[PDB]
Structure 1
Amino acid sequence: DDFVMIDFKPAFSGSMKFVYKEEHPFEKRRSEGEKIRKKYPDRVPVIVEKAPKARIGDLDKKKYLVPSDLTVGQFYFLIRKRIHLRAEDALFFFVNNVIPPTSATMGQLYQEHHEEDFFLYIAYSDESVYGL
């Protein structure tokens, strides 16, 4: 009866390339993701990498186990400190090529955007457009 109301996404959404995915075979990632979801069900596994062409410090660690109820805004706050951003430095996240809502929880993002390996992938940048 009723129509499913589909939300619009830009044409380039889902075009996120990650070095992590190139360096770790899919089935190893997927096996790990399944296991870590069972081991820590109140956390979500997240890969965080610099966006292509970003001009910003690199993280020493890419793999994060994040409480599901942590907001995107709180994750910004933590990441800024890990790379010693200055007060005037910008930081943007992208999930599937789109800046996620600052008020979303990481668990909400995970539900909507996790990949088939059971990981959520977040790119970060000094720029507000992914890969610019």
Structure 2
Amino acid sequence: SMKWMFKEDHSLEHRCVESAKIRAKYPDRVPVIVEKVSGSQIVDIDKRKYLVPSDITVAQFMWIIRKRIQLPSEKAIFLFVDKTVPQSSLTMGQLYEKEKDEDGFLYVAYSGENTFGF
């Protein structure tokens, strides 16, 4: 399974309130939690929390992550939302409305392989 440190560090109600707070303050931005898939052949990420405009695409968000972890261009990266790889052409706003957690955050896992899910 995916075990999210964000959810282990904060109660459901804490996250519900905080997600609602940023969405009220920044209605055109989506709060994203990013964590590495356990065991993956990829470096862990230093920045876990992102507030990204809804107008960037999934491909663009992947680029942001790749750059954060200094992943070489020739080396692949896969994102997973609820165990499926999202389509790169979607906007982060579309992804958020279709996959947001019960707590109002969007949880995106990343890996160097797509053996984890669909």
Cα offset, 1:52, TM superposition: 1.6
TM-score by length of 1: 0.84
After superposition, residues 54-69 of structure 1 pair within 5 angstroms as 54-69=40-55
Equivalent residue number for residue 68 of structure 2? 82
Q: 3-state DSSP class of the match of 1:64?
A: strand
Given that 1:34 and 1:118 are in contact with CA atoms closer than 8 Å, whether structure 2 keeps it comes out as: yes
CA distance in 2, matches of 1:96, 1:44: 17
Per-residue CA distance 1:38-90 (angstroms, 9 max, x = gap): 01100000000001211211111111001101100101111111111112211
CA distance in 2, matches of 1:78, 1:127: 18
Cα offset, 1:16, TM superposition: 4.1
CA distance in 1, matches of 2:39, 2:25: 35
CA distance in 1, matches of 2:110, 2:39: 11
Equivalent residue number for residue 104 of structure 1? 90
Give ranges in structure 2 of 5+ residues lacking alignment.
Answer: none
Given that 2:2 and 2:38 are in contact with CA atoms closer than 8 Å, whether structure 1 keeps it comes out as: no
CA RMSD of aligned residues (A): 1.3
CA distance in 2, matches of 1:64, 1:77: 13
Q: 3-state DSSP class of the match of 1:84?
A: coil
Number of aligned residues: 117
Structure 1's consecutive aligned runs of 4 or more residues displaced over 2 angstroms after TM superposition are none
Give ranges in structure 1 of 5+ residues lacking alignment.
Answer: 1-14
Given that 1:16 and 1:96 are in contact with CA atoms closer than 8 Å, whether structure 2 keeps it comes out as: no
Cα offset, 1:129, TM superposition: 2.3
How high is the sequence identity, in percent, across the aligned residues?
58
TM-score by length of 2: 0.93
CA distance in 1, matches of 2:92, 2:3: 20
Given that 1:33 and 1:45 are in contact with CA atoms closer than 8 Å, whether structure 2 keeps it comes out as: yes
Amino acid at match of 2:6: Y
Q: Mark the structure with the bigger radius of gyration.
A: 1
Given that 2:12 and 2:103 are in contact with CA atoms closer than 8 Å, whether structure 1 keeps it comes out as: yes
